[PDB]
């Protein structure tokens, strides 16, 4: 995939719900989950632009009422080739 989807949440439990809602919703790959610091967790998905569009909308709707909530839901249809170096390829 080329499109990036991202859901930031306050806490892991909201983020796991978004990762599940997003990956169930459309053909996107969970490429990373990052603990930013201060209780901010980002879930990142890379797929086609249509799937990433549908996925990120599913995640945002799922995690909004879960736990502390959603900080952000962003789609970047094609990141610059430079931003690829700061993007995870496989979750750890």
């Amino acid at each position: 995939g080329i499109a990036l989807g991202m859901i930031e949440t306050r806490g892991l439990v909201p983020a796991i719900e978004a990762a599940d809602a997003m990956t169930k919703a459309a053909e996107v790959r969970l490429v990373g989950r990052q603990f930013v610091g201060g209780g901010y967790v980002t879930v990142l998905v890379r797929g086609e632009t249509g799937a990433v569009n549908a996925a990120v909308r599913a995640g945002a709707d799922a995690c909004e009422r879960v736990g502390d909530g959603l900080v952000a839901a962003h789609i970047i249809a094609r990141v610059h080739s430079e931003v690829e170096n700061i993007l995870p390829k496989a979750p750890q």
Binding site: E17, D61, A62, R65, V66
Partner: peptide
């Protein structure tokens, strides 16, 4: 995440 929750979704100082 309760099935219902999803279905619907469709102190002292010291």
């Amino acid at each position: 995440g309760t099935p219902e929750f999803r279905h619907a979704a469709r102190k002292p100082e010291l």
